[PDB]
Every structure is written in C-alpha cells, then in structure tokens.
Amino acid sequence: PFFDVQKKLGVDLDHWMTIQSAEQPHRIPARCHAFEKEWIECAHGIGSIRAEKECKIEFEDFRECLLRQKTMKRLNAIKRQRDKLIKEGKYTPPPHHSG
Amino acid sequence: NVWAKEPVLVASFAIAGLAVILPTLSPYTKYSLMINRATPYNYPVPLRDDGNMPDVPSHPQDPQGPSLEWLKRL
Amino acid sequence: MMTYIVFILSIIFVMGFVGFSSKPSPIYGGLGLIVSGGVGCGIVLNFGGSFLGLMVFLIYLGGMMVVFGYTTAMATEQYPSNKVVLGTFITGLLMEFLMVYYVLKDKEVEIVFKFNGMGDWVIYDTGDSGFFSEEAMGIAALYSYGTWLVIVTGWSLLIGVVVIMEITRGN
Amino acid sequence: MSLVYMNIMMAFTVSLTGLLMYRSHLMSSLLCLEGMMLSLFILATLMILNSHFTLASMMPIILLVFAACEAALGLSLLVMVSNTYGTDYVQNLNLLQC
Amino acid sequence: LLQAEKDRRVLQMLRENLEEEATIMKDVPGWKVGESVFHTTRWVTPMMGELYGLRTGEEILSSTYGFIWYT
Amino acid sequence: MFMINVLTLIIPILLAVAFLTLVERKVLGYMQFRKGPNVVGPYGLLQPIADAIKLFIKEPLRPATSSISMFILAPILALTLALTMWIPLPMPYPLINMNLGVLFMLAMSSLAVYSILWSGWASNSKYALIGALRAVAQTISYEVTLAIILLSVLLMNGSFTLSTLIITQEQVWLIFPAWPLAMMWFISTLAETNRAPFDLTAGPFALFFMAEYANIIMMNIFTTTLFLGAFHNPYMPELYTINFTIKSLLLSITFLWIRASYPRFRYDQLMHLLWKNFLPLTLALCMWHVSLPILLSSIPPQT
Amino acid sequence: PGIVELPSLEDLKVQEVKVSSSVLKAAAHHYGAQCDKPNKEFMLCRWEEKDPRRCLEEGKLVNQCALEFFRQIKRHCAEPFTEYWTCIDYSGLQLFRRCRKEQAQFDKCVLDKL
Amino acid sequence: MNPIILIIILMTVMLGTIIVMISTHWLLIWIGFEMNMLAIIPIMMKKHNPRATEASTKYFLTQSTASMLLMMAIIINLMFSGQWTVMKLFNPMASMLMTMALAMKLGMAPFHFWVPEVTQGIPLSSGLILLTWQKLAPMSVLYQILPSINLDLILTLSILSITIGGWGGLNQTQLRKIMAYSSIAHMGWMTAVLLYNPTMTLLNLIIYIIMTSTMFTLFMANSTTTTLSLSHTWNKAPIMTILVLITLLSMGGLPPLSGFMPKWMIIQEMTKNDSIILPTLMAITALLNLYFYMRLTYSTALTMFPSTNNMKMKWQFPTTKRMTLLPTMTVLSTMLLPLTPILSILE
Amino acid sequence: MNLMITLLTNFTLATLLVTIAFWLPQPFSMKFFLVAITFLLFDLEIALLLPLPWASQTTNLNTMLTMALLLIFLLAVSLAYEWTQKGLEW
Amino acid sequence: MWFEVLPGIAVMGVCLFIPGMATARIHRFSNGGREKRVAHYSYQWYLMERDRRVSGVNRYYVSKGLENID
C-alpha cells in the first residue's frame, strides 16, 4: 500500500525533487515552464480519468514542447525539399547570408 | 591518559568536537547568511508600479530599498 | 571534423559495447568498457557536460574498472581467436552498419518509434544568460534541499561496507 | 526527437543482450551490466541537459554512484565464488539443481 | 540592453527565416506557412533549428558548439 | 597557431626530462661525494642525449608477450597521459581555461594506475604480476588522500577555475592557512610519483621512464601553482614565469633531496601508516576546513 | 493549427547600437544611473507578457535611450573614457578592479564636469 | 555474525522496504529495492557452506539485473512525458519493461528459475525473511502503477505462474522447494486481480504472509529437510502433527478453514466482470496444487512411517526451542473464517 | 574538438615515437582484494563528498554544515569499524 | 662542487621555462595584443558572440569602442 505520513507529519521532505516549476535554488525556469503550469492547473481537481479525456489538447502541447517531435518533422521535410530543389537547380539559394 | 595511547585519534576527536561546537558561539554566521543571500543570480524582476506604496524605489540611486553597506566597509 | 561528431562518437560507443559484449577474456572486456566510457565521456561533454562527464571518468574509469581488472588479475586465469566471439562481433557490426545505413539514406528508422533521422545540432540553447553552468548549481543543491537523498545514499554505502566485511569474513 | 536517443537506446539493447547471453566468464556479464549502467547515465543526462531540467539534475551522478556500489557488491561476490572454487566459470555451478 | 538586442536578433531570424520558408515551400500541398506545431497561443522559446536552420554549417557550428569546446 | 601552442608545450618535455635525469644524477652525486657526469662534454647534457639515443639504438626486448597489441597499448597510454596532463596548468596563461581542472588531474592519475596495471598483467609470469599488483595497491591507496586534501585546500577558494587560485594567492601564500594539509599532500605526491622512500621492488623502459619523470614535473608544477608563488601583473608574464620556474625548481630539488637519504618502507607499514594515520587526520582537517569558513565570515566568491 | 503573427520589417529597423562589448561593459553603471529609468517599462512588459513581438516599441525606446546616452558621453568629457575602456579591454574577462585609478579619473571627469 | 550486526541488517531491510512503501520518487523506489538486496545478501550465507554461496550468487545476479531493467523502464518514462511522480505511466513499452522487472523481483513463471535454487541451500530463517519481504516489496509498487498496464502482461504471468507452481511441485520432497513452488502459485493468485480490485491482492498478501510464517515456524520448531524427518516429528510430539494438518489444509484452502477466504473473494470480484472461464481455470489449478500438500499430510500425521530409536533418547528432553510467535499466528491464520467483512479493514 | 585536436596530436606523436623506436633496430589472497574494495567504497563516498565546494553559496548554511559533517562522520564510522574489526591486519 | 651540477639543472629549467612563455606570446599575438577570452559560462559566450557579431570583421578582438555611438 501507499501511505501518507508524507502529508501527515507536515514535513514535505520529498515534494521538491518532484516536478519542474517548484522553486529552483536560483529562481530560473525550465524550458517548458508555462506549459506545465497550465497543464497542472488543467488537471488538478480532477479524478485522473477526465484528465485522460479532457486535458488532452494541453497535454499534447506540453509533450510537443518537451520532445519537439513533429516540429522537427516539419523542419526535416523543409530540409529534404530544399535539398531536392537545389539538386534541381531552381533559384541558386539566396536563403544564406545574402541575396 | 589516552594522550599517550592513541594520540592522533584523540587530536582528531578534539578538532572534531570543536568543529561541531564552534558554530554555536560565532558572531559571524548571520554575516555569512547575509552575504550569501545578498548575491543575485537571476534578474531582479520589476513589478507593476504602485498602489501608492512607500517602498520599491523608482530610481536605483534611491536608498529607500534594502541595500548593502557592510560589504564596502569590510 | 564536422557537424555529426556526436553521432560518430555514438557509433564508436556502440561498437565498444559490441566489442566487449562478444564475451572476450575479461581483461579485453575491461579494455572495451574503458574505451566505451571514454567515448561516452566524449558524447556527454559534447552536450556539455561541464561536470558530470568528467565526474563519471573518475568513478568508472577511475575506480571501477581498476577493481574489475584487479579481480581479473587475481581470480581468473584464462591461459591460452574463437569462432563464436568474433562471429558475434561481425554480426553486431553488421547490425550497426544496417541501422546507420538506413538512417543515412532514408527518412527514419523505427524499432517501434519514429527516430527523426539527422544529426543533432537540434535542440540546444538559444544563447541564454547561463552564467553558472546550470549543472554546477543543480549539483550545488543536495545540501539545502537534499535532506533525505544524501542521507539514504550514505547510509546505503555504510551498509555496503558492513555487508562486504561480513561476506568476506565478518568480523 | 533528438536523433541520438535512438542510437543510445539501440546501445542499451546491445548491452542488455550482452548481459543476457554470455558464454564463459561472469566478469564479462558484470562488465556489460556496467555498460548498461553507463548507457542509462548518458541517455538520461542528455535528456536533462536538453530539457534544461535544472532543479533535479541529480539523477546522472546519483544513479551512477548507486549502481557503482552495486558493481562493487558484484565484484565481492565474484571474488568469493572464485575463492571457494578454482575458476569463476558459469559452469562448475551446476550443483544445487532446480 | 543585451536582452533587448537578443530579442530583436531572434525575432529578426524568425522573420527572415519564415520569409525564406514562404519562398521555398510553395510546391508541397498543405503547408500553412508559419504554424507552430503547438496548440497554445504562447511564444515558445525556439529550438536552435528554427533560429539557426539552413545556415549551412559554419555559423551554426560556431554558435551552438562554440562555448562547449572553446577553451 | 594552436598546433604551434601544443608543440611549444610538448617539445620541451623531452629537454626537461633528460635534463632532469642529469640533474638528479648530479645532485645525488653531490649529496654523495661524487662529481660527474662531466667527462662527456662540459658537465654532461650530451650525456642524457647520448644515453637516450643509446637506449633507442639498443635492440628491444624480444616477445615473450601476450596480446602484442595490449603490450604496446599500455605504454602508449602512459606517455599520452604524460603529454595530455600539462594542458590546464596555469603558468600565467594556461593552454585551456576550464571550468574545472583538478578533477581532471585526479582522473588522469587514475589512468596512470591503469597504465601500471595493464603493464603488470601483460608483462610476464606470476611473480612480476604479484609485484605489480602490490604496486597498483600502494598507488591506489593514496588517491583517496590526495583528492581529499586537494578538495580541502580549494575549499578556501571555492572555485575550480585555478585562475581564481592564482588570484587568491596574491596576499599570502596558501602554505600559511594550511601547512599540515599541504605537508600531507606533498607526501601524497611522493606516493603518486612512486619513488623512494616507497618501494617498487618491463619495456619500453625509456617510455615508462618518461612517464615517471613527466609525472614528477607535473606534480611539482601543480604544487607550485597550488600552495605558493606570487602575484602576476598583466602585460608582463616573464616576471611570474621566472618566479614560478625558480620555486618549482627549488621544490623539485627538495623532492629529490628528500629521496636521497631515506630507506624504503615496509609494505604493511606503508598501508598501516597511510590508513591509520593519514586518514583520520585528513578527515579532521576536512571537517575543520568545512566548519571554519562558515565561522570566519569568509566563503569564497564562487561566481 | 494556428499561425504565428510576426511583426513586419518596418518595425524591425531601429538604429542598432553597433558598439563593442568591453566599452559597453565599462559604460554600464552610469548608464544605469542616468538612463535605464524608462526601460523597466520594457522589463515589466517582458515579465507580464512572455511575448516579444509585442514589447518591441519599448525595445526601440531602450535602444534610442542607450544611443542618446552614448551620444551625450561622446560629445562631452571624457575622451580619456576611450583610454579607460582600452585599459580594461585586454585584461581577459573584464574585472572592474583592474584599471581602478583611471576609473577614478573618469568618475572625477564626469562628476566635476557633468 | 554479531547480534548487533543482525539487528542492524534487520533495520536496513525494514528501512529499504519502508522506503519502497513511503516514497513518491522513482529513484527512491530503486534505492529501496537495491538496499533490500544488499541487506538480504548476508542473511543468506549465514553458515559458510558452498550451497548458500551459490544460492546467493544466483540471487544477486537475477536481483541486480531486475533492478537495472527497472531503472531502464524509469528512464524510458522520462524519455517520454517526464516527471518523478509515481502515477500512470506514459508508455506501453515502459510499463511492459517495468512489470517484467517486478516479475523478476518477485516470483513469476518465466522468471522463477532462481526461487527453488535460492531456497534449497539456505537455512530456514533466511528463506522466511526473503519470502516475506521479497514478496511484500513489489506489491506496493504494482498497487501504485496499476492504471497504465496492458492487462495481458499481468494476466499471462498470473495464469502461467499458477500453473507452473502447480505442475512443478509434484516432484520434490525438499520442503524448501515445496514452499517455493507454493510461493509461485500464490504470487500468481495475488498478482491476478491487480487490475480489478487490489484490496483482494493486499488481503491475499496478508493471509499468505501469515500462513508462510506459520509453516516456516513449524519447520523451525524441529529442523527438517524431508518428510521422513516429519515422521520422526510425529513420533516425538503429537501437537506438531495436528498443527501440520491444520496449516497444510489451510494452505490447501478448504471452506471450513481460513485459507479458502482469499480464493473465494477473488472469484467473487473477478466474476462480477465477464470473466468466468478464467476463474474456473484458476480454481482447477488451485485444486491441483493441493495434492502435494495432501501427500505431505499423508506422510506426516495420518499414516505413520517407521521410526528410529534415539527418539527414545529424545523423550527425556522436553522441547526447548523458542518460537518467535507460533500460536497467535496459527489461530490468526486458520480460524479467521467468520471474519470475512474484515475485508474492508484494508482500504 | 580543440582538446580533441590536442589529444590527436599527442596520440599521433606518441605512436610515431613507438613505431620509429620499433622499425629502427631490426594463486591469490583475500588481503589483496580487501584493499581494492575499500578503495572502491571510500572512493564512491569521495564522489558523494566532492560537490561540496560547489554548494557552499546558498541560503541554507547550517543544514549544509550538518549534512557535510554527517557525510564525513559516516565515512569515519566506516573507517573506524573496519579499523577496529580486524579489516586491515596482517 | 655543485657548481658542476647547476649547468644541468639550469639547462633543464630553461627547457621548462620556454613553453608557457612562448604560449603566452602566441596568445598575445593571435589577438593583436589582447588576451584570449576565457569561456566557462553561457553568459560569457553569448557576450562574446554578440561582440564578434557587432565587430563587422566577425572577430572578437577589435573591440569597437565608442566610435559607433551616433
């Protein structure tokens, strides 16, 4: 079983190693701070089932902040398209440093 | 006594015990904590101006805010 | 000498893991794990890596493989290569060659994932005001916030000491 | 997806198969356990660095020191087995049959 | 002051790089020109491939990997 | 220009080591009642040139090896440590300014332990293996002590950059706030260089010899940076380089001078002495150098 | 889904203060004294909205304030301000305890004259 | 062995298991499992025979690779959506690796090859403490992370562990192997109902721990390895025989006796779903693993094997073993039948 | 890669020295094992100690002093235990 | 006497005197009298990057003071 002496004694000795956005020793954020704050406020007073079926949009926003999967997919598609059209030869590219 | 028996151990216990005790009788620990607190890492973030509060000074020259003066004077 | 140096050092890393997972004599195994630890240090220092990758180097390449080679020297003999060892090394090189060939000349290689295949200059910091090398102040916690963690870690090492002496004839 | 993570997970599978299939010496098995340890270390460290997960950046070094003292216990057990026998093979252990 | 110059420079790379993308991708179907992949209406910090993308090697190696092995 | 910097570091190491051989032979000769080597030219600098090129000329040890590649792989590691360990050492401007260098020092000392162990396994039959095994034990027993003491002496300065060390040495020498800790550190440097009064009783003998003496000059330079020295006014580095060279030379002469006149220790006396006398005393100095900067209102400006 | 709303190239033209780093570092404190009063507008904009592409008018304001400040220090005393920052330039990372007497000289110039 | 050192090692076993119970961080759970291993290694090799040495070697290898595969599952969890909260996981692959790690931690059918070998060459006290705390420590974790597990994992391991602890078990007269195969069958039972109502799993954990404590206390009362030694215990004392009768029948689970109560409630809150063929298969195998209990009872207290003299000598000495707590655990373990609505004492 | 350039130059010049030096002229004890494991465990405790000079600038100083003294105190208890209990004797 | 050993130690000390002095000379030569800028933090590297960006020569040593204000 899981017990709750952590809450019972009033010593929150283990809740600070836990998430981001708990106060760092110098007040700096992580890379996805605000996404976490809105996601935690979305799924706080929630029985973890309408958390699964209701906060899905902001959770996917947070996941794609954390890993940046499909944004890299879009950038990689741009890179492959740029490579094949410079292989073609149309507009010897002025996207680098000059016209 | 044991000063002839195992002397480096007794010296280690003595310097150990004074290292335990000596921060209790210390007129400099509050100085240490003020030095350690008064060094900022992040940006000192401003705030929305006033509810006409006699704090949070507008010019950084204004000494109404809490500053450091025991730094320059050792 | 170019951009994908993290990827290339990762290639040498997985080659080193194959090079002692082929089961040689364990002093060759210690050599393979030392080479693998050095290039893993290279990878994490390429991510920077300012403290932790130089920190592992004293422990594994400073304190662990020493005792592994020590115990290789004092316990087992292995006094005289083989078909099975070098054959597994060949098949491991073949599997790495196949995976990296399909990373190179295609889009992505999927075990069950979508590994977006290009070298990682992404992602990285956009030149922030770090000023303290965030690893450094992070590990410069554990003594203000770290009440429980270092206590149970040191307690586990103390119990490790009494365990080792008991099994090696306590008291 | 930060492509290098695929290679380090494949390296984890390399070290895990090297831990599981092992022919003669227990020392190679223990050293591949150490390699698996290094793989988890590096993978989690690159994740925490690119996340700027700066508060709880303790995971690499503390995972390291714990599984290092695990490897120390394994060294002592291998020394005890090699002390009560001649060698430290996987064979000469077929006593105590299941 | 450094913060203001940094913000103007990263928005400069954003504007010029989306202009480059709008010039370069008019062949593929779909493709809205400047969609964040994310959903919330917030300025996310870019990922050093949105800033230093398609700059061909030299500046991105001297920018990302500069401090990492500069002495 | 950077490869020119590297070659101007690692070209004078051969000069330094060979002239250290003549200097140790002459200084032992005058601690004794001997002149010479001085028949081989004036005072014998061509004498280290001559015996170095002689040992290159002389026919190598025939194998008699086990894994030829491993047998060559150990001394190549020893000499590349001896080369790659003068990179962050500041005489006034070091080659690479690092965030941390002292942990790199201790890590490369442990790689020297690897060199000893690999040469010991790949060498020969069982008796030399037992001898090199005891050598690895008596080498590894001191990296506890030296790392502990180096940590407690940098704790007065808080940072690892070591240019902060050359700043913080400006007022007093660091021998005055820590003399016993520095003394025990110097004994640990005698342990790491593996010389008399500590016992060790191969191929290539010249390469193992080279690694030995470059390790000695390394520890002497790191000592001279670490515990003493003087200021450095910029736009004149010759002044600090002169004072640094003179103090490091006096300390290396003192090092060989301490070697010159003491018998070798018993091995169990060596382990007994190290554990039961240096290890509680190092712990005592560590706990006092922890609890003292929180006393005297002086915790360093670790930027 | 939603597309970003980037600012134009018409707002991305401020007279940029293309000055070097050591002179900007040595000219920091009195720039904190006279100017840097209306840029906490910019700081509060940046910390009440986490969204540059919006607070850029105040970025143009701090840009013109810093350029006006360096104009004002350019026209009057000191010209040995140039001597002061080139005294502090070649000293590695710029410690401010390096060239202290000329710091006193520049302070006495700007105090007795401005 | 020093008694101070044994009190310290018991303190560290309790510390590691309480850290597994109480923490909310993943590193702390891994530390608790590792410290449980490190402390439980010198309880084994309490003597210095090579049997305990090889047993501890096998146990250390399997336990350490289970610990590191658990750490692999956690680092996969932070490769995906990353926070150190013991909650729903965020990968079927990570949950798969994690439940297979815990299946190595506590006695499961693909992974049970170390359990009879680790129990055979050790004394009784080490076997008792390893069964109790090494079958208590992962159950808290599985009770935590149940809402993100593919069910076929848990159900396949449960079915196959019940039938392996059944079929393997008809062949050994080594009593430690008998109790180990019984442990495999009951851990299959106690894992089976994890995704339906875990109150049944924890109540079955309580009942199984008390039953195994009674059984091993009865074996520690008179040192036996085989059934013939139990027939000599029949000759020397009669009350141990009726205790072996009652405790073996309560391991068998008969409805007048308290060992039936964990089976019956499992069948109830399993068949309130659409699972019927799976309960009747599990309860047929529960009929199967009673047979070696029954031939053990036939060997001990009901038929009688021929005895050897010097039992005549042992008559002149009354019994002088200390029991830790035998009779309280016995009547708590066997007469607990009309206290079924002490089900809801748990959640 | 700059220190990798230095490492490459040192490694290549060392291999040149070795290969031009070579082309031209033509049981055990438990007491051996206890010291190595004692090294290993005290070295891991050194690894726990050594981020102490990183940490000494925070707003929680008394607690840092207490747990740092606890770490060296535990290390001293381990040392004195194997000292008194014939761990290093001959 | 030890007058006959001081040439050996003298020449070997000169062999140890040379590389740091020549290295510092190459440091001062490779930036035009400047010292090479040390880099340990992201803050110093970003300041160095904007310094070498504003210089026009893409070189961080020119140091462009006060003569591009207005």
Swiss-Prot record, chain C:
InterPro entries: ComplexI_Subunit6, NADH_UbQ/plastoQ_OxRdtase_su6, Nuo/plastoQ_OxRdtase_6_NuoJ. One of its GO terms (biological process) is mitochondrial respiratory chain complex I assembly. It catalyses: a ubiquinone + NADH + 5 H(+)(in) = a ubiquinol + NAD(+) + 4 H(+)(out). GO terms for cellular component: mitochondrial inner membrane; respiratory chain complex I. Its main location: mitochondrion. It comes from the Eukaryota. It is found in: Mitochondrion inner membrane. It is an enzyme of class 7 (translocase). It is a multi-pass membrane protein. Its EC number is 7.1.1.2. The chain crosses the membrane at residues 1-21, 25-45, 47-67, 84-104, 145-165. Keywords: Electron transport, Membrane, Mitochondrion, Mitochondrion inner membrane, NAD, Respiratory chain, Translocase, Transmembrane, Transmembrane helix, Transport, Ubiquinone. It holds the Pfam family Oxidored_q3. GO terms for molecular function: NADH dehydrogenase (ubiquinone) activity. Core subunit of respiratory chain NADH dehydrogenase (Complex I) which is composed of 45 different subunits. Core subunit of the mitochondrial membrane respiratory chain NADH dehydrogenase (Complex I) which catalyzes electron transfer from NADH through the respiratory chain, using ubiquinone as an electron acceptor. Essential for the catalytic activity and assembly of complex I. Belongs to the complex I subunit 6 family. This is NADH-ubiquinone oxidoreductase chain 6. It comes from Ovis aries (Sheep).
Swiss-Prot record, chain D:
It catalyses: a ubiquinone + NADH + 5 H(+)(in) = a ubiquinol + NAD(+) + 4 H(+)(out). This is NADH-ubiquinone oxidoreductase chain 4L. It is a multi-pass membrane protein. InterPro entries: NADH_UbQ_OxRdtase_chain4L/K, NUOK/Mnh_C1-like. One of its GO terms (cellular component) is mitochondrial inner membrane. Belongs to the complex I subunit 4L family. Signal peptide: none annotated. PANTHER family: NADH-UBIQUINONE OXIDOREDUCTASE CHAIN 4L, NADH-UBIQUINONE OXIDOREDUCTASE SUBUNIT ND4L. GO terms for biological process: ATP synthesis coupled electron transport. The keyword Transit peptide does not apply. Core subunit of respiratory chain NADH dehydrogenase (Complex I) which is composed of 45 different subunits. It is found in: Mitochondrion inner membrane. The chain crosses the membrane at residues 1-21, 29-49, 61-81. It is an enzyme of class 7 (translocase). GO terms for molecular function: NADH dehydrogenase (ubiquinone) activity. The keyword NAD applies. Core subunit of the mitochondrial membrane respiratory chain NADH dehydrogenase (Complex I) which catalyzes electron transfer from NADH through the respiratory chain, using ubiquinone as an electron acceptor. Part of the enzyme membrane arm which is embedded in the lipid bilayer and involved in proton translocation. Keywords: Electron transport, Membrane, Mitochondrion, Mitochondrion inner membrane, NAD, Respiratory chain, Translocase, Transmembrane, Transmembrane helix, Transport, Ubiquinone.
Curated annotation (Swiss-Prot), chain F:
It is found in: Mitochondrion inner membrane. Its main location: mitochondrion. It comes from the Eukaryota. Keywords: Electron transport, Membrane, Mitochondrion, Mitochondrion inner membrane, NAD, Respiratory chain, Translocase, Transmembrane, Transmembrane helix, Transport, Ubiquinone. One of its GO terms (molecular function) is NADH dehydrogenase (ubiquinone) activity. Core subunit of the mitochondrial membrane respiratory chain NADH dehydrogenase (Complex I) that is believed to belong to the minimal assembly required for catalysis. Complex I functions in the transfer of electrons from NADH to the respiratory chain. The immediate electron acceptor for the enzyme is believed to be ubiquinone. It catalyses: a ubiquinone + NADH + 5 H(+)(in) = a ubiquinol + NAD(+) + 4 H(+)(out). GO terms for biological process: mitochondrial electron transport, NADH to ubiquinone; mitochondrial respiratory chain complex I assembly. This is NADH-ubiquinone oxidoreductase chain 1. GO terms for cellular component: mitochondrial inner membrane; respiratory chain complex I. The chain crosses the membrane at residues 2-22, 68-88, 100-120, 147-167, 172-192, 202-222, 238-258, 279-299. Its EC number is 7.1.1.2.
UniProtKB/Swiss-Prot annotation, chain H:
GO terms for biological process: mitochondrial electron transport, NADH to ubiquinone; mitochondrial respiratory chain complex I assembly; reactive oxygen species metabolic process. InterPro entries: Complex_I_Subunit_2 (IPR050175), NADH_DH_su2_C (IPR010933), NADH_UbQ_OxRdtase_chain2 (IPR003917), ND/Mrp_TM (IPR001750). It is an enzyme of class 7 (translocase). GO terms for molecular function: NADH dehydrogenase (ubiquinone) activity. The chain crosses the membrane at residues 3-23, 25-45, 67-87, 96-116, 122-142, 145-165, 178-198, 200-220, 237-257, 274-294, 325-345. Its EC number is 7.1.1.2. It catalyses: a ubiquinone + NADH + 5 H(+)(in) = a ubiquinol + NAD(+) + 4 H(+)(out). GO terms for cellular component: mitochondrial inner membrane; respiratory chain complex I. It holds the Pfam family Proton_antipo_M. It is found in: Mitochondrion inner membrane. Disulfide bonds: none annotated. Its main location: mitochondrion. It is a multi-pass membrane protein. Keywords: Electron transport, Membrane, Mitochondrion, Mitochondrion inner membrane, NAD, Respiratory chain, Translocase, Transmembrane, Transmembrane helix, Transport, Ubiquinone. Core subunit of respiratory chain NADH dehydrogenase (Complex I) which is composed of 45 different subunits. Interacts with TMEM242. Core subunit of the mitochondrial membrane respiratory chain NADH dehydrogenase (Complex I) which catalyzes electron transfer from NADH through the respiratory chain, using ubiquinone as an electron acceptor. Essential for the catalytic activity and assembly of complex I. Belongs to the complex I subunit 2 family. The gene is MT-ND2.
